[PDB]
Amino acid sequence: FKPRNYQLELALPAMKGKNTIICAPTGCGKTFVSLLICEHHLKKFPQGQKGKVVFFANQIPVYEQQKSVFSKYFERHGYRVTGISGATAENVPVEQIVENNDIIILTPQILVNNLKKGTIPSLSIFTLMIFDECHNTSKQHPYNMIMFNYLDQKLGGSSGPLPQVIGLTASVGVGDAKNTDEALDYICKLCASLDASVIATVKHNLEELEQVVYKPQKFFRKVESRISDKFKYIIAQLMRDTESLAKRICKDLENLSQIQNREFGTQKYEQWIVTVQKACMVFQMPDKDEESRICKALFLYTSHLRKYNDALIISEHARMKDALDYLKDFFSNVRAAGFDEIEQDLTQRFEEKLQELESVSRDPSNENPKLEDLCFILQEEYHLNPETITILFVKTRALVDALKNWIEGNPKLSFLKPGILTGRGKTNQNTGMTLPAQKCILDAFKGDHNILIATSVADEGIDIAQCNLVILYEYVGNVIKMIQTRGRGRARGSKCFLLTSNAGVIEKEQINMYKEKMMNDSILRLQTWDEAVFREKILHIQTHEKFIRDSQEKPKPVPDKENKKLLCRKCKALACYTADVRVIEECHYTVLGDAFKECFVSRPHPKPKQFSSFEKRAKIFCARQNCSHDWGIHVKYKTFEIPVIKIESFVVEDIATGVQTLYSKWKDFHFEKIPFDPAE
RNA sequence: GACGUACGUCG
RNA sequence: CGACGUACGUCC
Ligand SMILES: [Zn+2]
């Protein structure tokens, strides 16, 4: 509530009617500086002119907090603040709420949707565009689209009372620049995209920064590897047997994915199996039943190989027991999903060696040196200080569950409550966690929880706690991710342990350490410039980028007027012709076919939440002998309960030429599409 | 459905 | 220098 000289010095360039980029690594300092600039911008207008400052937020956990803070702050001045969101807009007159409201905190995508639809024609209605974490203004971001609209209005010739852009952040970022010659080009490109002339950064009051932003130290502790690989050998033998079984039916299983000699347990093998699955998914034979059985067997074999490779990666990055539990969970999930000959044979071949797998996993001499060093450093830090609230980052979510189970079931360490924290992630399956559950887990992080397993969700702006220990367990990021993960240690005395087996992530961290100093030197060089030359440079860059954007403008190619039959992938059963495909909002594709209504079963959706204008109703699945394949969703548009299918889980087949093709996104699949009319 | 990041594979 | 795959995260 009391503005100090530190956070007041960052407001001097902003309180001059010029576009600035404030860079403060502090959490509360950034929002406090935004409040000070809002106060100075709403108290400087003469009598009879009101302000329409607009704060932006990319996430709901940061949007709700900023809305609460703004509502608590602008209560003694008489300023209306409501804010808009994905859930707040229950058919809300956005035009009326923007015309009546003073401080709007809508998340960007709403403003982009409004600018694309026609509501709020120009941004001249606003007078101060505040961006939170403006470093995310990368290629085709929502922030980037708002700034594209702003630059178009500025350079076209219809230049009106344009608003001020004071986009806040904590690190400008470098991207893929190697030398200082490009670390400045990237920052100038970012400043031109955000249309700013000054980079606000403290140069006088470094004492407050050094005293309240106490930063941890790096403890790169590379460890041993899987020299003891009895589990890996058994899984590799099983993978070789199932690969030979898959080659028994498919002769040419080597010229479909010509990449390199595949190696069991690597990402290369995952890419190889995905490529061979997508190549054998279109194997056509003029029988329509034997080809269907062949594609089914090949899909089952490729899925089993992918699951075995994932289990090998989990066994390499954690205990063998959790990888065996993951394999058993997959086999139990496919057990209740229909007993055909292929899955039966595979399950029998698995249970043949399941006893040896359980024995080798229960063998207490096969503990991973990664986990040994992890528990060793954990007990070391907890003996040095019993009250140390730590946080570790893990790449995979199955690996996160594995680490949680390992911290739970361990006799050596039993003073840790492994509170899981993954996030929403993909809103289609039973995985991830809800926002009200994540909020409760973060609020119980004072306290009945000390350790927690995160997947790059720990940072991302969202407020946390005073964590005095970070462990990047087989984790690696770029300069912005490293600065965000480093800033989480703010209390007096912290560490940033990095455990790994591959020297690659060590080299990445070592070059990011130099990239941070390069970004600091580039920011200093850009600050020690002149306003006129820098404005001319950013104007030249904006003109060049606008010319490139206007050049790269292709509405759509010619639509092929044919009647293709979208049919299943793993079953190859004719689902529906492309004639019965209706476009809802140039995003979603539905089917009206009465004959199609008997070719799919429905299941209760695991996580309901309405997006845009679709109530999150049931999930569809293929209806056949034994398919159980995901086909999309079945939702109510406004009053009609129609199924929206996903092209990703659908192989295309033309009746004329007879060749099969694959398409991942609906945008890529080009065909004569008619809008969805509420007639049938 | 859109967007970003990381790792990786091909020319 | 472009295409792609996986994982992760966010939004509508
Ligand atoms: Zn099917």
Tokens found for residue A362: 């229960």
Distance from CA(A504) to C1'(B7), angstroms, rounded: 10
Instruction: Print burial letters for A151-182: b (CB count within 10 Å at least 16), e (below 16).
Output: bebbeeeeeeebbbbbbbbbbbbbbebeeeeb
Element containing residue A240 per DSSP (H, E): helix A230-249
Sign of torsion over alpha carbons A332, A333, A334, A336: positive
Distances (CA, A) of A8 to A34, A368, A531, A619: 11, 51, 22, 53
**How many CA atoms lie less than 13 Å away from A390 in the CB half-sphere?**
28
The answer to whether A136 CB sits below 7 Å from nucleic acid chain B is yes
Coil, strand or helix at A305:
helix
Contacts of A638 (CB under 8 A, 6+ apart): A613
Coil, strand or helix at A80:
coil
The answer to whether A503 CB sits below 7 Å from nucleic acid chain B is no
Diameter over CA atoms, chain A = 84
Beta bridge partners of A633: A644
Cβ contact A360:A229 at 8 Å: no
Element containing residue A642 per DSSP (H, E): strand A641-645
- On the 0-12 / 13-18 / 19+ scale of CB atoms within 10 A, A223 is middle
Contacts 24+ apart (CB under 8 A), A366-370: A366/A228, A366/A230, A366/A231, A366/A320, A367/A319, A368/A226, A368/A316, A368/A317, A368/A318, A368/A319, A369/A223, A369/A224, A369/A225, A370/A223, A370/A224, A370/A317, A370/A318, A370/A473, A370/A474, A370/A499, A370/A500, A370/A501
Tokens found for residue A618: 């049931």
Dihedral pair phi/psi, residue A282, rounded to 5°: -115, 20
Protein residue with the closest CA to the C1' atom of nucleotide B10:
A259
- The answer to whether A568 is a known ligand-binding residue is yes
Distance from CA(A478) to C1'(C8), angstroms, rounded: 14
Name which of A186, A184, A147 is nearest A19 in CA terms: A147
Distance from CA(A283) to C1'(B9), angstroms, rounded: 22
Sign of torsion over alpha carbons A134, A140, A142, A144: positive
Angle (CA) A178-A184-A188 rounded to 5° is: 135
Cβ contact A236:A58 at 8 Å: no
Angle (CA) A248-A249-A255 rounded to 5° is: 90
Protein residue with the closest CA to the C1' atom of nucleotide B7:
A267
Nearest nt (C1') to A426 (CA)? C9
Tokens found for residue A497: 């342990």
Torsion of CA A31, A479, A427, A630, to 10 degrees: 170
Nearest nt (C1') to A395 (CA)? C8
Nearest nt (C1') to A647 (CA)? B1
Name which of A575, A629, A599, A625 is nearest A341 in CA terms: A625
The answer to whether A565 CB sits below 7 Å from nucleic acid chain B is no
Distance from CA(A175) to C1'(B10), angstroms, rounded: 24
Cβ contact A149:A160 at 8 Å: no
Chain position carrying tokens 């690969």:
A243
- The full set of domain ranges for chain A reads 1-214+530-558, 215-227+368-529, 228-367, 559-680
Mark the nucleotides of strand C covered by protein, meaning any atom under 7 Å from a CB.
Answer: 4-12
Tokens found for residue A102: 């003073």
Q: Rounded CA gap, A338 and A324, in Å?
A: 22
Beta bridge partners of A473: A394
DSSP symbol at A614: B
- On the 0-12 / 13-18 / 19+ scale of CB atoms within 10 A, A12 is exposed
Nearest nt (C1') to A270 (CA)? C6
The answer to whether A394 CB sits below 7 Å from nucleic acid chain B is no
Tokens found for residue A17: 């009617």
Distance from CA(A667) to C1'(B3), angstroms, rounded: 15
Tokens found for residue A580: 């019965």
The DSSP line for A347-369 is HHHHHHHHHHHHHHHH-TT---H
Angle (CA) A310-A314-A317 rounded to 5° is: 135
Helix, strand and coil content of chain A, in percent to the nearest 5, comes to 45, 10, 45
DSSP symbol at A254: S
Nearest nt (C1') to A61 (CA)? C10
What's the one-letter identity of residue A642?
I
Angle (CA) A530-A531-A532 rounded to 5° is: 95
Distance from CA(A209) to C1'(B2), angstroms, rounded: 38
Contacts of A88 (CB under 8 A, 6+ apart): none
Cβ contact A661:A279 at 8 Å: no
Tokens found for residue A175: 């991207």
Q: Rounded CA gap, A49 and A123, in Å?
A: 17
Cβ contact A292:A326 at 8 Å: no
Q: Rounded CA gap, A403 and A317, in Å?
A: 10
Q: Could you tell me the end-to-end alpha-carbon distance of chain A, in angstroms, rounded to an integer? A: 60
Nearest nt (C1') to A145 (CA)? B3
The answer to whether A612 CB sits below 7 Å from nucleic acid chain B is no
Q: Rounded CA gap, A475 and A444, in Å?
A: 25
Which residues 159 to 218 of A reach strand B, CB within 7 A? 175-176
Nearest nt (C1') to A648 (CA)? B1
Q: For the beta carbon of residue A100, count every other beta carbon within 10 angstroms.
A: 10
Cβ contact A302:A246 at 8 Å: yes
Q: Rounded CA gap, A396 and A112, in Å?
A: 32
At what angle are helices A290-317 and A267-280 packed, to 10 degrees? 170
Distances (CA, A) of A432 to A186, A427, A481, A495, A607: 35, 8, 21, 29, 10
The answer to whether A260 CB sits below 7 Å from nucleic acid chain B is yes
List CB-based contacts (under 7 A) with strand C: A 58-61, 85-87, 89, 107-110, 113, 142, 267, 270-271, 274-275, 278, 395-398, 422-427, 432, 438, 455-457, 460, 609, 611-612, 664, 668
To one decimal, the resolution in angstroms is 3.5
Sign of torsion over alpha carbons A84, A85, A86, A87: negative
Distance from CA(A140) to C1'(B4), angstroms, rounded: 9
The answer to whether A478 CB sits below 7 Å from nucleic acid chain B is yes
What's the one-letter identity of residue A103?
I
Distance from CA(A522) to C1'(C6), angstroms, rounded: 35
Cβ contact A323:A311 at 8 Å: yes
Sign of torsion over alpha carbons A272, A278, A281, A286: negative
Protein residue with the closest CA to the C1' atom of nucleotide C7:
A396
Distance from CA(A79) to C1'(C5), angstroms, rounded: 50
Coil, strand or helix at A272:
helix
The DSSP line for A555-591 is ---PPP----EEE-SSS--EEEEGGG-EESSSS-EE-
Nearest nt (C1') to A273 (CA)? C5
Distance from CA(A256) to C1'(C4), angstroms, rounded: 15
DSSP symbol at A59: S
3-state SS of A150-196 is: HHHHHHHCCCCCCCEECCEECCCCCCCCCCHHHHHHHHHHHHHHHCC
Q: Rounded CA gap, A578 and A595, in Å?
A: 13
Contacts of A658 (CB under 8 A, 6+ apart): A284
The answer to whether A370 CB sits below 7 Å from nucleic acid chain B is no
